[PDB]
Amino acid sequence: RTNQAGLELIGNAEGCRRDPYMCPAGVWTDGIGNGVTPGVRKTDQQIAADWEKNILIAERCINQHFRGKDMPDNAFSAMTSAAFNMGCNSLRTYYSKARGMRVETSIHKWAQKGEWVNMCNHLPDFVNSNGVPLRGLKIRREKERQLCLTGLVNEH
């Protein structure tokens, strides 16, 4: 279902090879050991082989957990892009240090209410990898947000 604009944001496996900000969530694991124990990384060829499956899994995340079937295509496609890049669990909850536990994300709260503008406006809440803030993720989230909002707000 992801539309052309969403697919531009997701890109392709060769794009992940050159710009690792484009890679699917599951490969953002280099060097983050604390264990669990180390394990071998994925090959480029495995990333390419699983690329479409991972888009499907992202769409399923949005459908199952974010009311995707009720969204317009632009919001759906933006949210799928975010789920592809960040993973479903990361969009559903986050660990609150203040409260000492995993809590629901605002983006999920708003999606469950069908409040797509508010949902879209929380895309830039997900700009960290392994707890480290990244400019490339902020840029990505903002571009997804603009897609997401297209048709939902006054165009001028």
Domain map (residue ranges) of the chain: 1-156
Largest CA distance in the chain: 53
The active-site residue out of 8, 16, 23, 61 is 23
Residue among 108, 81, 87, 88 nearest 9 (CA): 81
Residue 56: C-alpha distances to residues 34, 51, 74, 82, 135 (Å):
31, 9, 16, 13, 27
**Nearest alpha carbon to residue 136 among 16, 46, 1:** 16
Residue type, 84: F
Rounded CA-CA distance 62/38 in Å is 30
Considering 14, 104, 115, 142, which one is annotated as catalytic? 14
Based on the residue annotation, tell me whether 16 is a catalytic residue of this protein.
no
Torsion angle defined by CA atoms of residues 110, 8, 46 and 83, in that order, rounded to the nearest 10 degrees: 0
DSSP β-bridge partners for residue 95: 102
- The reply to whether CATH 3.40.720.10 applies to domain 1-156 is no
- The reply to whether 14 belongs to the active site is yes
Resolution for the entry shown, Å: 1.1
Technique behind the model: X-ray
